[model samples]
Target chain A: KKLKLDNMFYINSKYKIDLDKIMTKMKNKSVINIDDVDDEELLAILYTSKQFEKILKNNEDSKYLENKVFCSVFLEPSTRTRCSFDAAILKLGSKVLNITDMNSTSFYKGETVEDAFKILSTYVDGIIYRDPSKKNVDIAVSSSSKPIINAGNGTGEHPTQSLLDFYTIHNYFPFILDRNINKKLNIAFVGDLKNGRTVHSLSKLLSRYNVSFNFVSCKSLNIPKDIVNTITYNLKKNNFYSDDSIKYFDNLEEGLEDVHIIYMTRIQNAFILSNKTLENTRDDTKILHPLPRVNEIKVEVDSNPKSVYFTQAENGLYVRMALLYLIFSST
Target chain B: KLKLDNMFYINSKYKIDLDKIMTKMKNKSVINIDDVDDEELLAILYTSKQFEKILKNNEDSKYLENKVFCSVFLEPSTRTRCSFDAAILKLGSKVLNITDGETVEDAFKILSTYVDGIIYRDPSKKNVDIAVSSSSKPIINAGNGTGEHPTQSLLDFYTIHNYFPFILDRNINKKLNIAFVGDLKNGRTVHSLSKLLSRYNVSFNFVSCKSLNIPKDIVNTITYNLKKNNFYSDDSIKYFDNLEEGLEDVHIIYMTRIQKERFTDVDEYNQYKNAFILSNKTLENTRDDTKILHPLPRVNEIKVEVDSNPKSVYFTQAENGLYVRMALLYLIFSS
Candidate 1:
């Protein structure tokens, strides 16, 4: 089936797809970045995410992507993202050809990324690729004939993770699901802002809604200047607000103040010397982390009512199931 | 669903019937080929042949729809792992691969919560046993270190039975002469196949260097089992250091790689590495219809020139693995 190209969005452009026609036009599309999705498509994804969650909770077997097989090829080690895709595919009544250990396959013998993707494309309908290099994902997209979902690329955007993070917030805070054009929400991003791809994509996605951002990091690990510029530029361009909407804090306590959500990320301990922990986040503020957390957040913080990290992890399965279903299903 | 007892021949010496024991055991397992009775062996082979025919005809069915399986390949394997993946997909089931840094027991415990059965391949037989004991779901042992690879043996037997249809008959299977050559001690495939073949009336000719001959315990076990079944005799089993002598008068020449990695002494391994290279010239004196089989990823044990020979059925042997595995998944999950 052909992809409904008219339903896709361009980053920082005025073009947008109608939310009502999202299912009709989203078939056979590849999700590479959060920047590629507009506000309407994100809302449509959120709506589909709830439906998947409901089906799963009811133990209903919905084979929306039946007779389809997706290949998950990971060039680097992964447990959560890999198994999350596996669970999602199985739950959706599709099949997965998992290449979890690249060392055991032909890829270990020095096969080119393009050649590998081309060969694997003949075996499956779609591909979920995760590599430590962003260029490899581009190579796969250009060389392969099948639709490619970028699971994660080297320091690049993880669009599906961003979608799930947004869905988790929307699921918990139903008021954000309103059609009002200008309802404001404040989010605090804490940890290695420069290297954390999760926050980068989430910030870009949240910029579409009328949300103010609080980026908290040490001086050496502060958010990249370009991302900051893009967030402010897009915020003003989309008429969400002016440049004054964004703020930075030297510590998490200040950032967590008057915020709706506190998003924590792991510090790249190998590259940085700083380790940040959250002890004083607001009692009512929700907490999120793209997990496998290493000392960035304490174990005691998990029991807090505001800690939605595990729920965020669980929501990843439903969000991914919706994406796979949307990409392969015909309306 | 309970497994049918018609496919199994229960020994009267055992108080409980096979099916009754299986139902009571609660833990379904495929530990070794020897665990299967003669009638069940025939049933699996016959089912595998049917699957082979169905695949050859390009037929598809959703027999295992909504069923999920987990594959834990703790060791490095491409052929066996991919074969299982393809088999599960062909049956319209889903497969979850666990290749993380967790222990086999830990992986099984977590994976059991997620899937219906487990396909585990580890380098240690003890670990496979651990997985079998810990897992409540069906456990298909893909391969354990030096332990039995039952599926490989099953497919190998199926291949031989397919080529020589007369062997399907119990009376004729006893008359077949098969040569097991190369690293018999380290080749788990050959070891498992020998035990499986012993269940029938087949005569075995094991050819290997003195340092790499079949282990004494395995020979004793096979001999004891065959004698217990009233099939063992002086003329039934033979061993030869010379490959050519073992190849004579055999209906099947099952070749195996001389596993250099299994040897503790590298220099001794190199000395006997090329002890039994089966080439076109080497097959001149063999029976005209002698079939050659190998559990592959071959490294010079069987010459490339020999692959083009009509008697070379190793490639076909590899293809049979897919159908045999399909048959197994069906038998285990359908019941």
Candidate 2:
């Protein structure tokens, strides 16, 4: 055999499928916000995630990312998001140069976030970054030419988490994919919507389909008006028409009444998801939480069949694997 | 049509006789130089030489493609960590540079569950032991505090042999004089190197500040090892006050930074940090055949001008570390 070498793999090898058609619309782009991905492309992402559930459930890792390394730089404490990305990168046949020291690598040594990322991006193929400040994360985003997946940029946006949340919703309600069939989704986004980056980005993604958003929050923690406007603007843009709607409720059970989805960020212990709350809700309704939850979520809620929050964390592995594959293939 | 992500990789057809060398080292750990006997130690360098040749051919070897390793660095690092990461990738294996260090027990406990091996570097030496007990798989010491950098010494000896091939040639009559400069008391590189070189017919020149002399335990062990191997002489070792003074007639100058991190007091560190400086003017005293070596991230110990000289092989030394590390990984993990 010839020793013909290039960045692309040899002709006869482990991975031989043509990705050009699958990734026809995906350019090498940074997912800094929910809007960075188009409506149809989001569907492609969810569909792509559907295919990789087996890779996650089973140990069939796709070794397409050989010789590629991605950097996981988290300046804050993390469990799900960081581990999901690390696990995803590895399962795709790649490596990860993780910088998760809370003392914050070289940032204290007078290296600017832009400079740190610029140099780090030089070392690895891509970077998944997180810090307490969105401004710092975006600085790295704007400066580096390499693809940066903003893991969770402070209170700004956790786009990937939001993406996985969308994927989870799509799998439960598969009719959302059929553009011709408008099966309306009622989602009650409870807890800290004002500061919940996940809820804000989730709002942007959910607006792409036919939906009624019942935001359950205290007065000070209500969903931001700009994000509320994003739903209005995106619904109009997607032409979901009069079926799409939004509502605000002070009471958790009031918001829980007719919703098809309950997304928890943080809540009062009194606002528990027990039999009292689920009794009046649609029987098919599912509970979702971007977790590491406090005492707000009940232990009884964990075992319930309708509670998909634990599955949500595991589904992140599938979605992340799909996302990294897309980013590598397209780039 | 293909399944999964629909991708391919560039694996050039390159093969080496790995089984012959891996017999002694497979499923092994290299925590310290003392873990392996001389025969196995020399086999590592031999294996490193083979991988070095493969590395120059620019061929990718997915020898450990199905395997994964975790680099748990609770300490700060740039070079050794980067080198191991690069080696694992180039060999077509996966590495998890375990980002968040929770508790050592929990980290290694869960790590052994998945990763094939662990390359650990922590501030305390006891943690490496704890990691070993906590871990069921092989654990390599990247730096277990000031205890030992076994791989660094492996690469160090490998570099030395490359410059002085006669050492391995069994040319017993061909004498070599090597100088150890800078932080002799605290520097683990020199400590490990001294033991390695003691195995040879090589003489030693210990050059450092009076306060920072070679430990008496090391001196006694070297004398014992040298005598048992029947290579010791009346003048097998000698202490010198300064680097320039000791450079005379030396065939190898192993320079090291006065490790400031190891120093407990700031004023003590300040005193000895700049203890030895190998300037170009000082280069005159060394034998022309002498090669300079440093396990780098050098904090101004070697003069910048000497870096361009033909004798300076630290860059080559650093480059050679990948092959040595790759060999170590293969030895521990390969069939």
Candidate 3:
């Protein structure tokens, strides 16, 4: 009954749950979730993914094929997202056809989605699409005769982001040395969880393993009821720990002292300005934001020693490359 | 003791006796009169032209991928026949182009006494086509680009004239068949029609099958022809077995007979005309527009009955094909 986390087919029949093939094709790699895994398979992937991290850091030409051509069609446009994918594909000796302006295409010319899919199918073997509309993603996946890798599908999920964040958490706290180290790994979730797709998806993936999760956010912007209930039920059953303890503190130093991973979400001005309760609890926290921030995590916090969001952005390319290779090779 | 007949040659080292190829390629059953089997190669093309004919009638898509396009850019044409040749290439197929047009067109016309004008130069399989202008004859048959066979011009001219009769319908009404009646089988007008006439819908009649039979090979190779013009001196020869039946079905009759005896006796010539000429009685058995024709130098063989029948337009038709062929050849080579 757990989710299949490899693709965005979370609630659909198109779900791809082939862990053996995934392991064999993407063998010797670090994967962080079990929605698409069995208990035995999860243990194997965790061990293998750690080795892959070392190999990836050392192997220069890990993937090279002059004939391989890729397309990065990002609609919302983030410099980090676009460049990372572009660099990975290029390093793998592939060509890329990048399209940012959805309006410039025939879609704006009144062409149907089917027509666009057919046209692009002729040009490239695989496509990575980043659009803000889940409906658009669904339509594209339905129409695409070729493989459709969802870079991000609206607020539905940021699966790769969660995967990378998990990878980073493991890097800082190598829980493999002692089972208790993993069991006791503490993490804090801050900012707008109610509407934060990243936080929800990431929390779901984290709940599968033995870890303590502390949800620290204003009452009004607390985690969605469905997601919080799922997390609570799973944590209780798995004997892990989870708490929606709204920390009412003037400083974030107490929160950061024991935490292994401090995940942060953007606090939009509209939400925070109205929540006088949040002002009382505001702190100088070691935080992370899935950037393009509209002043939720103040820029002044960027220089803090615990601040790893910039490095997180850089690590995105490696994590995404790992995920992309897994999806394609597994399929 | 006697001079052999003149023949067209291509590739001096491996000179092809055009007659042999024509004979080997032609269907032996069809009959044509003009005594110039050389013309048959281009003429008989009409027999198998049903596909293209249908396409022309419907004129749907202009994509011709099957054509072997050869371009000889002998001269530059800002707005000449290139459009027509381009049309041919766009229809899908290969094209042959040559750069020299003027000199090639002129040379081919001069060598082949049966030719009128050319449209290109430095003729090669890769670069020969018909003149884009001139309607006096089948342009492709005349040759362009220093080569014989003004194919583009001839096809264009014939198709245009056939479709748009308003410009030259009067000419087609004349002798539907012109055997270039006489010893002048080698003449340009007869030779051109020998190759060109196969495209039209008509039957042929020749006055003298014995002395003026068309060359054997070209006639057989060509699918269509005027029967009487294909006459042979030997009745035993399969080429000349039928005569009366040929005249029965024919509409226009082109006559080409020896002119040496014309000055001798008006009565003797009159006798020949009365015997061979299309008289009122002959007209009774023929189409209403059945007319008699000679490329010129008629030795009184054409009866007076055929001329007044309101169909005698051979001269005018000859003139129209000239312009049509000229325009066609010019376009093929220039464009």
lDDT of 2 by residue, A240-298 (tens): 64643888888876898788889988542445567567778888889998876665567
**lDDT winner:** 1
**What does candidate 3's lDDT look like per residue over A81-173, in tens digits?**
555565555544455787876776776778876778767866886777888776776677667766666677675666557665666666666
lDDT of 2 by residue, B75-99 (tens): 7787899899988988777776653
DockQ for each numbered candidate: 0.15, 0.08, 0.00
Which ranges in model 1 have alpha carbons more than 4 Å from their true place?
Answer: A1-40, A53-155, A169-191, A203-266, A269-317, A324-331, B1-43, B56-148, B160-178, B195-205, B216-239, B243-252, B260-270, B277-292, B297-316, B332-335
In the range B1-335, model 1's lDDT, one tens digit per residue, is 32333334433433334454333333347877766776556556756776777778886644566777888887888889999989998888878776533345544544554567889888885988888876768899898875778889889999998877566454634477899998988887887888777776778898988878898877887798678767788988899999779899999999888777887799978887888899999999999989999989788889999989999999999999998888778777763
Q: Which candidate, 2 or 3, has the higher lDDT?
A: 2
lDDT of each candidate versus the true structure:
0.77, 0.75, 0.46
Query: Compared to the true structure, candidate 2 yields what TM-score?
Result: 0.57
lDDT tens readout by residue for model 3, B7-41: 33231322445334444432121111232233343
* Candidate 1 residue-pair clash tally: 1
Model 1, span A1-331: residue lDDT tens = 3222222353113334454477667777888888777666776677677777776667665567766888998878876677778878887777778786678898778888889888889998899999888588888988888888889988577889999999988876655545346567789888789889899888887776678898888888889888887888877876776665888888655777788898888776322212234445445678888876666666566556777777787788878887887777754
Judged by DockQ cut-offs, the docking class of candidate 3 is incorrect
Clashing pairs in 1: B174-B201
Higher-lDDT candidate of 1 and 2: 1
> For model 2, what is the C-alpha lDDT against the true structure?
0.75
